[PDB]
Amino acid sequence: GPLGSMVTEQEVDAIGQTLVDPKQPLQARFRALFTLRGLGGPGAIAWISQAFDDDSALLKHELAYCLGQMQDARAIPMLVDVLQDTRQEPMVRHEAGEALGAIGDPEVLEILKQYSSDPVIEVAETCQLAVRRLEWLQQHGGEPAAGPYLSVDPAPPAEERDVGRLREALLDESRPLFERYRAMFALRNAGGEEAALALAEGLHCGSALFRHEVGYVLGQLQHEAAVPQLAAALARCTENPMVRHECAEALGAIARPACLAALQAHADDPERVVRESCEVALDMYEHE
Ligand SMILES: [Fe+3]
Ligand SMILES: [Fe+3]
Ligand SMILES: [O-]
Structure with missing residues (x-):
């Protein structure tokens, strides 16, 4: 009508x-x-x-x-x-x-x-x-x-289908950021533990923007293998707040017991963006 x-x-x-x-x-x-x-x-x-x-x-x-x-x-x-x-x-x-x-x-x-x-x-x-x-x-x-x-x-996903080869491309600080992003998205799409663990190594890489994107695609993938690295990044008090926020949100999406402790621990962080991400992530932990 x-x-x-x-x-x-x-x-x-x-x-x-x-x-x-x-x-x-x-x-x-x-x-x-x-x-x-x-x-x-x-x-x-x-x-x-x-x-x-x-x-x-x-x-x-x-x-x-x-x-x-x-x-x-x-x-x-x-x-x-x-x-x-x-x-x-x-x-x-x-x-x-x-x-x-x-x-x-x-x-x-x-x-x-x-x-x-x-x-x-x-x-x-x-x-x-x-x-x-x-x-x-x-x-x-x-x-x-x-x-x-x-x-x-x-970025569009890389053509390479081999998870190991994708990991190498992801973690290679000499490659242009766009090519590393293509690998990141191809890892997400591959899914599974090996890909989740490859991505999680990206939390120890150089650019802040890069590390937040890794957080985001780990929250999309929702594999629990990423939890310890996500929680560790969230716990870094010197890390860029953008990265800490994205890792909090990913923890909320994954919603396993090990995610709860981390999110609760930073619910009162001094960084507003971190507090607020934990507030929304804890609600998601609720509805999952
Ligand atoms: Fe962003
Ligand atoms: Fe964000
Ligand atoms: O962001």
């Missing part, structure tokens, strides 16, 4: 009002956000965009992640404003850069090349990878064939 489309706009607005309200608990705001991500459309994009001046760097970066995954060019202007705003935390600017790559519209290429030399290393590296992803999409005629995960990833 003709009313479903009116009712849906009513529901987007109700949900958006929850997301933008700083008095709602984080978990309720995340539930709103991920619902808007799925619903899509211009109303949803506008509500998501409104929350970019929240105090939570965790929430703000998830806004950007969602805009990227939605692959709707209507988001580009806001994502550009976030990437260029030097008062935004590195992880929020990184997530906006990445999201510009995820949308796959090559109108953003000049801005991404510009921010490829940003003085914030996480931002620079993100944009370098985003440019490589856009150049790959141009060369291959569009997105890679659908893989086992529904996410829009920052």
